[PDB]
Amino acid sequence: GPVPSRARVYTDVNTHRPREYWDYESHVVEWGNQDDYQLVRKLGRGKYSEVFEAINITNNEKVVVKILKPVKKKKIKREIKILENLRGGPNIITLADIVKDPVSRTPALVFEHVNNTDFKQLYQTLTDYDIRFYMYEILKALDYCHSMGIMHRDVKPHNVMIDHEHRKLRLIDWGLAEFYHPGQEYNVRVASRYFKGPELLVDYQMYDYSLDMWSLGCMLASMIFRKEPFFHGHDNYDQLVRIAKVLGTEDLYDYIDKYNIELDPRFNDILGRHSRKRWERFVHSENQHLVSPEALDFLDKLLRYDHQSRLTAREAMEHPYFYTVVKD
Numbered sequence: 300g301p302v303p304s305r306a307r308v309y310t311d312v313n314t315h316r317p318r319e320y321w322d323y324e325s326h327v328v329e330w331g332n333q334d335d336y337q338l339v340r341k342l343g344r345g346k347y348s349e350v351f352e353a354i355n356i357t358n359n360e361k362v363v364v365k366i367l368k369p370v371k372k373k374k375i376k377r378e379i380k381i382l383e384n385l386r387g388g389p390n391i392i393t394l395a396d397i398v399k400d401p402v403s404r405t406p407a408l409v410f411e412h413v414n415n416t417d418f419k420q421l422y423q424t425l426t427d428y429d430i431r432f433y434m435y436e437i438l439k440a441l442d443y444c445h446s447m448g449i450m451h452r453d454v455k456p457h458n459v460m461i462d463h464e465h466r467k468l469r470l471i472d473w474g475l476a477e478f479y480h481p482g483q484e485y486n487v488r489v490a491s492r493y494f495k496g497p498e499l500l501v502d503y504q505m506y507d508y509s510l511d512m513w514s515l516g517c518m519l520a521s522m523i524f525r526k527e528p529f530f531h532g533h534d535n536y537d538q539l540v541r542i543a544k545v546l547g548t549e550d551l552y553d554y555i556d557k558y559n560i561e562l563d564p565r566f567n568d569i570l571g572r573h574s575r576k577r578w579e580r581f582v583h584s585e586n587q588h589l590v591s592p593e594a595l596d597f598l599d600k601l602l603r604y605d606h607q608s609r610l611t612a613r614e615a616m617e618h619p620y621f622y623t624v625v626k627d
């Protein structure tokens with residue numbers, strides 16, 4: 300069978316914290332008053348919720364209200380517990396309140412408001428310095444939640460709110476996040492297609508925080524190469540082919556061989572043979588101002604098949620890529 304795997308860092312965080320830290324099924328929600336918040340406009344509708352701009356009339360404060368669609372109470376308490384465990388963390392969205400929505404019959408989460416510009420406009424104008432700056436700010440958030448025993452599992456541009464005027468970043472949408480427990484087998488149906496790690500795409504369930512580092516690598520490649528998304532698969536199978544055409548098939552086989560994993564035989568007719576490419580081939584006159592040797596080396600150390608070989612968030616913050624970023 301498959302070879303087990305554990306994270307190389309923060310392995311035992313949850314087994315040394317009290318059961319109440321991670322046993323989200325037993326969490327008792329503390330309810331606020333739903334009448335404190337007036338909905339202003341709908342911002343978005345997802346698979347599991349709808350998001351609204353709102354105002355706290357007992358505050359005059361702008362907030363964001365996320366009203367949950369029905370899903371098993373386990374996953375609602377999971378997201379609530381995770382947001383409360385992480386509240387106050389560097390660049391973590393702050394959960395201000397929780398209420399019962401009378402119409403939906405489901406909880407509604409109240410968040411701090413971030414005056415963000417959508418990434419499709421923002422990524423068109425981010426400079427080399429901006430990308431390094433915001434990548435460092437994301438790394439602060441990930442190392443924090445990783446150090447707190449939590450993996451986000453849905454890192455993507457949509458889940459990174461940026462108020463570019465105030466240089467403020469928040470990592471949002473913790474609805475897929477989960478507590479890391481060594482040896483635990485997790486659902487591989489997480490993250491968006493373009494940001495799924497190879498571990499998900501080969502159905503290896505004993506993954507860890509390093510999944511988020513793959514997703515971050517995918518974001519980085521889209522930004523510095525100005526190709527969003529970078530690995531643009533048509534489905535989950537073609538997604539791994541897209542990755543293999545860049546990272547090569549020999550290291551893909553080394554990866555699945557290390558973990559005693561087999562590919563789905565439907566890859567037989569589609570995967571092919573590919574050498575590993577030099578990242579410089581994606582450089583051209585329209586993105587070269589975003590690319591440096593340090594950028595390519597950093598990206599190369601995030602986008603590894605072997606989840607055990609990717610930089611940790613901590614190690615990533617040590618990379619020369621960030622030497623130019625002013626640290627507060």
Ligand SMILES: COc1ccc(/N=C2/NC(=O)/C(=C/c3ccc(OC)c(O)c3)S2)cc1
Pocket residue numbers: 342343344345346348349350363365392410411412413414415460471472473474
């Ligand atoms: C496109 O449909 C959806 C549906 C649900 C979503 N899920 C969230 N999960 C969070 O935590 C969110 C927090 C948030 C969003 C925007 C903000 O400012 C504009 C802000 O301050 C906080 S959104 C996202 C998009």
